[PDB]
Amino acid sequence: DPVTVVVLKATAPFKYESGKSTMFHATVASKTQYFHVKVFDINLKEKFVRKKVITISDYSECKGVMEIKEASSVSDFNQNFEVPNRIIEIANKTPKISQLYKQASGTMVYGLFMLQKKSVHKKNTIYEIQDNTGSMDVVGSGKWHNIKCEKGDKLRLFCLQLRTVDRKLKLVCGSHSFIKVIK
DNA sequence: GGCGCGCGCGCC
DNA sequence: GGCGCGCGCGCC
Numbered sequence A: 001d002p003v004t005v006v007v008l009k010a011t012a013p014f015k016y017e018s019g020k021s022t023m024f025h026a027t028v029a030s031k032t033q034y035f036h037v038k039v040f041d042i043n044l045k046e047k048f049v050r051k052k053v054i055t056i057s058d059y060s061e062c063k064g065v066m067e068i069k070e071a072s073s074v075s076d077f078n079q080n081f082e083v084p085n086r087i088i089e090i091a092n093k094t095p096k097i098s099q100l101y102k103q104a105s106g107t108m109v110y111g112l113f114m115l116q117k118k119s120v121h122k123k124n125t126i127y128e129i130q131d132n133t134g135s136m137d138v139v140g141s142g143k144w145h146n147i148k149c150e151k152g153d154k155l156r157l158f159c160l161q162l163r164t165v166d167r168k169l170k171l172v173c174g175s176h177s178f179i180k181v182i183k
Numbered sequence B, C: 001g002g003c004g005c006g007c008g009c010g011c012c
Helices: A085-092
Strands: A001-008 A014-016 A021-029 A035-040 A053-056 A060-062 A066-067 A075-078 A108-120 A123-129 A132-140 A156-166 A168-172 A178-182
Touching: A001 A035, A001 A085, A035 A085, A035 A156, A066 A075, A132 A156
Parallel strands: A035 A066, A132 A168
Antiparallel strands: A001 A021, A001 A053, A014 A021, A021 A035, A053 A075, A060 A066, A108 A123, A108 A156, A123 A132, A156 A168, A156 A178
């Protein structure tokens, strides 16, 4: 059903494969929840700006993440719209590596984590991330082999998937994964 | 090329 | 939710 939200975050459009297309990620908030959104129509980028209020209908979902394909289904909302501020806070919280270690393979993961160790191999790059509860490997290939970063930088992860790899839960990149290196 | 407008977002 | 530095990018 149609849902009206306020945009909290939205990345710049980026290239990806399976067919090779374009997309960006966004995070939005109703008055009762926050959601991650994959937008596959890059002509909607102007509707997904910080603080813009939009109404989303005729979309699809997948593991709690919204998918938007046709611009025909986003409309501006210019009446008054206020979301409770904890929804904003939750929407911006990065989960703990100790909780990530307790979810099922398949779970999609988004957050900001600091990069403690970078190991580059032939086709894969293992980015070790840490917080005050644990460490975890991020596996990046293709677009995310050997990206520019060093110890102390932080990584913003968008739509990474928890997978068991050599008997341990890791984050691995797929077609829609995005990683941004900060500072 | 490369100015300069004005956002993004980590930090506050 | 505000701030402002760093930057992305339309324009010439």
